[PDB]
């Protein structure tokens, strides 16, 4: 009985899908700086989160 074709379901997942694509970008470029971001670090230490996730 596999069926997901209700516009309620599709639109409700769709708006959070647009959120899960773009909302981190939009919010992170709209908020003001309240700390100082650490942006100078060695290359094994900058790539740590992505490498650990891939591993």
């Amino acid at each position: 009985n596999i069926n997901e074709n209700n516009p309620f379901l599709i639109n409700s997942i769709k708006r959070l899908l647009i959120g899960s694509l773009f909302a981190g970008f939009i919010i992170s470029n709209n908020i003001p700086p309240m700390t100082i971001p650490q942006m100078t670090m060695p290359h094994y230490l900058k790539m740590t989160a992505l490498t650990v996730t891939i591993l």
Partner: protein
């Protein structure tokens, strides 16, 4: 017409759910590649990390005694 249930076989797909699913998958990969093309430093690194061992004793003030 709504989806009829099937028995021991692949269910009926609508054209709309398939094209929307493929469209948002292509949207995701477009966004990943686009922001990777433009930013390219939130992932790989913003500024070069200098080597402290390559620094001279003159600029750090280490008089030789």
């Amino acid at each position: 017409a709504h989806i009829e249930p099937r028995y021991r076989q692949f269910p009926q797909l609508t054209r709309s759910q398939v094209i929307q699913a493929e469209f948002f998958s292509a949207t995701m990969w477009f966004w990943i590649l686009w922001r990777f093309w433009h930013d390219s430093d939130a992932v790989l690194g913003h500024f070069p990390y200098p080597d402290p061992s390559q620094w001279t004793d003159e600029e750090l003030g280490i008089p030789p005694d």
